[PDB]
Amino acid sequence: MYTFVVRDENSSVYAEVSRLLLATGQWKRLRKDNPRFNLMLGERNRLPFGRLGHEPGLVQLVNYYRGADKLCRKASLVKLIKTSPELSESCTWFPESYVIYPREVFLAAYNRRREGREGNVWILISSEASELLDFIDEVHVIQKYLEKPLLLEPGHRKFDIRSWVLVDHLYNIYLYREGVLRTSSEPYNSLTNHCINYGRYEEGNEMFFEEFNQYLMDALNTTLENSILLQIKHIIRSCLMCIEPAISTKHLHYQSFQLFGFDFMVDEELKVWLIEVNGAPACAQKLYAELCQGIVDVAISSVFPLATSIFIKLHH
Amino acid sequence: MEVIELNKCTSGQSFEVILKPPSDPSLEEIQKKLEAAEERRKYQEAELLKHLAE
Amino acid sequence: MRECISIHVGQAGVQIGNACWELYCLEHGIQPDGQMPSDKTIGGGDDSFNTFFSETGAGKHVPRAVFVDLEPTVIDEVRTGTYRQLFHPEQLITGKEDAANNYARGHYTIGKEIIDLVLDRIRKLADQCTGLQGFLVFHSFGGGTGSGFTSLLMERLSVDYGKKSKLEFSIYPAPQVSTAVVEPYNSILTTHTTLEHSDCAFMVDNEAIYDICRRNLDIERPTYTNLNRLISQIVSSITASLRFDGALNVDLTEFQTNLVPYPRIHFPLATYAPVISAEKAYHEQLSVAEITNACFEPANQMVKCDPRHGKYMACCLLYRGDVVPKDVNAAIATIKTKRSIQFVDWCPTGFKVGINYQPPTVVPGGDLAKVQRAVCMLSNTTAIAEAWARLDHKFDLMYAKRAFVHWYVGEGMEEGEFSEAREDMAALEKDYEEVGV
Amino acid sequence: REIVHIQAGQCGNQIGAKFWEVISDEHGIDPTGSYHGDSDLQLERINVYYNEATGNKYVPRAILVDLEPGTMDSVRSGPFGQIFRPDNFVFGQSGAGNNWAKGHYTEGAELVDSVLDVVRKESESCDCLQGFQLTHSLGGGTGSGMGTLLISKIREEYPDRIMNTFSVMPSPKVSDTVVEPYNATLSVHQLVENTDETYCIDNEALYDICFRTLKLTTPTYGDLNHLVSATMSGVTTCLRFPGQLNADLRKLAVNMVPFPRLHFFMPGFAPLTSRGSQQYRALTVPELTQQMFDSKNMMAACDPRHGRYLTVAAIFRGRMSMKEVDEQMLNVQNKNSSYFVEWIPNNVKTAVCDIPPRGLKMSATFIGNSTAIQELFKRISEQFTAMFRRKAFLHWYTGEGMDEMEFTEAESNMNDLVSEYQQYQDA
Ligand SMILES: Nc1nc2c(ncn2[C@@H]2O[C@H](COP(=O)(O)OP(=O)(O)OP(=O)(O)O)[C@@H](O)[C@H]2O)c(=O)[nH]1
Ligand SMILES: COc1cc(-c2nccc3[nH]c(-c4cccc5c4ccn5C)nc23)cc(OC)c1OC
Ligand SMILES: Nc1ncnc2c1ncn2[C@@H]1O[C@H](COP(=O)(O)OP(=O)(O)CP(=O)(O)O)[C@@H](O)[C@H]1O
Ligand SMILES: Nc1nc2c(ncn2[C@@H]2O[C@H](COP(=O)(O)OP(=O)(O)O)[C@@H](O)[C@H]2O)c(=O)[nH]1
Ligand SMILES: [Ca+2]
Ligand SMILES: [Mg+2]
Ligand SMILES: [Mg+2]
Secondary structure, eight states, X not given: OEEEEEOOTTOHHHHHHHHXXXXXXXXXXXXXXOSOOSEEEOOSSSOOGGGTTOSTTOOOEEXXXXXXXXXXXXXXXXXXXXXXXXXXXXXXXXXXXEEEOOOHHHHHHHHHHHHSOSOOOBOOOOSSHHHHHHHHXXXXXXXXXXXXXXXXXXXXXXXXXXXXXXXXXXXXXXXXXXXXXXXXXXXXXXXXXXXXXXXXXXXXXXXXXXXXXXXXXXXXXXXXXXXXXXXXXXXXXXXXXXXXXXXXXXXXXXXXXXXXXXXXXXXXXSOEEEEEEESSOOOOGGGHHHHHHHHIIIIITTTXXXXXXXXXXOOO | OEEEEEEEETTEXXXXXXXXXXXXXXXXXXXXXXXXXXXXXXXXXXXXXXHHXX | OOOEEEEEEHHHHHHHHHXXXXXXXXXXXXOTTSBOTTOOXXXXXXXXXXXXXXXXXXXXXXESEEXXXXXXXXXXXXXXXXXXXXXXXXXXXXXXXXXXXXXXXXXXXXXXXXXXXXXXXXXXXXTTOSSOOEEEEEEEXXXXXXXXIHHHHHXXXXXXXXXXXXXXXXXXXXXXXXXXXXXXXXXXXXXXXXXXXXSEEEEEEHHHHHHHHHXXXXXXXXOHHHHHHHHHHHHHHHHHHHHSSOSSSOSHHHHHHHHOSSSSOOOXXXXXXXXXXXXXXXXXXXXXXXXXXXXXXXXXXXXXXXXXXXXXXXXXXXXXXXOOHHHHHHHHHHHHHHSOOOBOTTSOEEEEXXXXXXXXXXXXXXXXXXXXXXXXXXXXXXXXXXXXXXXXXXXXXXXXXXXXXXHHHTTTOOHHHHHHHHHHHHHHHHHHHHXXX | OEEEEXXXXXXXXXXXXXXXXXXXXXXXXXXXXXXXXXXXXXXXXXXXXXXXXXXXXXXXXXXXXXXXXXXXHXXXXXXXXXXXXXXXXXXXXXXXXXXXXXXXXXXXXXXXXXXXXXXXXXXXXXXXXXXXXXXXXXXXXXXXXXXXXXXXXXXXXXXXXXXXXXXXXXXXXXXXXXXXXXXXXXXXXXXXXXXXXXXXXXXXXXHHIIIIITOOSSOOHHHHHHHHHHHHHHHTHHHHSOOSSOOOHHHHHHHHOSSTTOOEEEEEEEXXXXXXXXXXXXXXXXXXXXHHTSGGGBSSOOOGGGSOEEEEEEEEEESOOHHHHHXXXXXXXXXXXXXXXXXXXXXXXXXXXXXXXXXXXXXXXXXXXXXXXHHHHHHHHHHHHHHHTTTTTTHHHHTTTOOXXXXXXXXXXXXXXXXXXXXXXXX
């Protein structure tokens, strides 16, 4: 029997996972503060990483990577990309982004394109620097709004892509084969959060990958793999590998795995851009069972065994 | 980077290497605390002996 | 030449001191009888080793050391051991019945009956010192004696020698080798009462020594002897600068200067490589670079914690054996590229290096093999606060119920002292968290 | 660090005799008091229970106490009768008639100072006396009433020493008289307040073990006492043989008793051994560890699954791998972490001793401070109230000076004890 503890009751994903682990009959859930756990589905905030891996006779795993927040908070993510050499200063796949605290770097580059007539619409989206900058004072990230998003028809709709990525204790990088396409139901006028019509063109403003592949073929004469997914695999891999020496638990007294959500926007020229990385992502309702079983298979049961895969290994 | 203040001798050497620059109670009070604990201990002992006398 | 006095308190202190003084005697070529032929200056001197030994008219070299246990069983083995002639009887002070794992019995009740005698033997040592610089105090956090009588002794030394440095070698409690359920209580209490009295403290988590023994020495069930021989290697690394020629960490003041910029944050992490089994038949000798790089693996630290998620305020490397500066700076330049080493903005990202050409000395019939080169790193990283968080959480679990509290109150203590010590610890964790994020 | 042993009453003296028999065979001391064994280990801590006499003879530090002469004449006639210091037989003549009042207020008051004189004369010749050990039942009169009187006196004279009792609890299955629930309840009031550790040996449990487990159809008191003496040797192994721990009464108390009145331990033994029946297959360490935590091996009839362990101490005896013992112990705690309180971290201590008990190559003794012990006290409380609500059999006590009030107070204190144990069962 294995033992495990839940300490984030909001996590839909790890609710799923704890239910699966229970229904294997080889896992038992403990009281939230029993230290004698094999596995910690831990909190989102102030997770007590200094307490793991000090229980004699207990292999401990946790579903978060200490340090990963530096990829999953807008300001720190931008910082990391600019400052780290693996990301090469201005790499090709991040929008121009700046940290301004509620300024000098923003003006120097932005006024060049305000003078050069090239579209100067950074992002709460405005074109006058003062209008949004002074408004933010009422930390924020100032990013270039890609004014040429990809046209999606019928409907002329803007969209974003979420891919779910699992990093296991060995630092394998697994991309879930099913990604999601969060569509905007209303057309675009020269924000796609499902939290903000809905349902006209496809169920719940969620377009899946088989469907989006067929659209890309029929409309644009290409494959999802070739046009978009290669760039997505390149970005996921470059990001996770920049921070590997800072977060890897290879020689540690406890072990980390973590599920990440990578958010991309594709422009009109079929180039892929990284919006944000999320450390606590929510799966799509159709995909919950499959992805959560995959977590159990490759992150949890790989360490705590019992007695074709749904992931692509991004090789490093 | 920059190696500084190297000192040698027949047992070894020492040096610094730099890579980046930067951006009480008295005896009186002790005896007071200890004796207060003493009085508390002797008082509890007396409460015991009183209970036993009852 | 300024003298240093060693004080070993309770069982852990006494047995670790044993291990250290035997190692020191092997290192300085001093025999089990107190004779050092190496010493041509007969009867005295002001040599570096004289920091730790005094000389008699009969050529006997005598530890500037006092052993102090509230019960006689352990110090009596010191009295009938291989090194019986080494110590003058007065140096070995023993009580009669112990502190029963109770901080308050060791501090208050049994403590006050022996504190004055200890202080007078310590003054008998101090009066044979031309220029005392301070004391090295060896003790456990979790014992009754090591906890309570140590904090009492520390307060008194502060008053009798207010100008002398005091360094701690402190054993942090680990359930694998544990002796009492209340050890978190004793730990918090003694830390809170000793803090302002202690200039630099080297913490040793019995968990870390234990796993090091099992993993790197292939010993399934480490005894105290294994743990203490290894511990004395690290201690000797840390004190060799006081017993030998060099320019780095030459007095106890320089330990605070180089390692402790803030007085409260005075717990430097020790890391030590290589720990290689004497039973390993074929062993490949590790390079300067391999052992320097081992210094940034947690599995070699005296306390398991993750320095990547903290900041550095200081960093020393003490090498012993075949080492040369060019190889050290080469290893450092390699490591900075590949590892997460962040300092505080108000400190220099730099390393203070100290090299002693003579390889680490090993006790014959031990578990450690000879190596051509070893290193002991002393880093003041905020990540050591992980130990405090652990301790404090355990303390909180018990204290929420006042479990065992009555044992303390029953020796004269007040519940208030518990809450006071815990608030001090919470402060300490907050200071660490501020410096480190 | 010497211990002074004291056995009082019929039951007191029988289990005590069996204890001294057992550990005297362990330490290689014959009935004439001479050492005829094969290891220095057997003497390294012989001072804890024996004094040295002329000619290198060993004499138990044991005071034998009764209000009747019968049982103690039986002890003298017994196989190890001659090993006891004759001066240390202190007896009255009238008896206590299974009556707590007689033991505590009338017949035992006459005798108690004489007992205390023999105590004193054993303490004065003790380099550093840790404390006292009492064996007695709680359902009769001498052991119950006079034993608790003695415990109160001794606490008066030696307030800073450890008081330790092995206390047989009464049960209707093994019952001499209907007034045992009275004698026990009065007794528990005393034990709650003047002892640091009390091993709750329940006669019910001993009977069930003898019946169900050892397949003895009609168990005597001798069989029940074989079990008690096994458990007592096991519990005291660490005082009597040297280990990594360097064991003593006070540190055991500190480590076992989070709250002063909750100091009543469930003992257990494994493997369960019938008298004389030889055990040919030694047990594996997993086996000792599963059995030792089995309810069928508990000497107090409580179901440990009905409560939570506050603290646990376990003692393994024999040549075995300490690695495997740690593995299995950690194993039990981690597989049943529900039944161990989480607000006392690392609340299970394990010691080992190389020397095994006579007859076995592998054995394990268990000392549990579980809240489930409330069951035992509840049982006595029920039996008590069933009579007391009709003031039945009270004349035996009021005739000796006692008043109904003292009974109501005793009942009330025990019900309080049950409430505390319950309080921490849900914390
Ligand atoms: N590393 C190491 N730890 C030890 C040694 N001896 C005891 N300990 C640890 O010390 C802690 C308990 O402190 P002790 O020194 O044994 O207690 P004490 O100072 O002798 O205090 P009392 O006996 O209670 O009066 C436990 O956590 C043990 O793990 C030792 O020789 N080496
Ligand atoms: C007098 O007899 C004995 C004494 C000792 C003992 N002696 C010295 C220090 C100790 N620390 C702990 C000890 C340490 C940590 C947790 C503990 C204990 C005890 C119970 N929990 C939960 N136990 C100790 C041990 C014995 O059995 C394990 C024993 O036999 C019954
Ligand atoms: N440079 C850019 N060009 C085009 N759209 C952009 C953009 N930067 C952000 N967006 C849009 O902003 C929307 C929401 O902003 P953002 O990426 O900061 O949070 P999010 O989409 O990941 C949801 P949440 O913040 O709740 O996790 C995205 O759906 C995306 O369409
Ligand atoms: N296990 C065991 N229990 C006993 C023995 N003798 C008596 N008892 C129990 O002790 C109680 C009677 O106490 P007893 O010692 O005979 O009374 P006392 O001698 O006047 O103090 C009853 O509950 C009996 O079941 C014995 O030899 N072994
Ligand atoms: Ca000299
Ligand atoms: Mg001790
Ligand atoms: Mg009878």
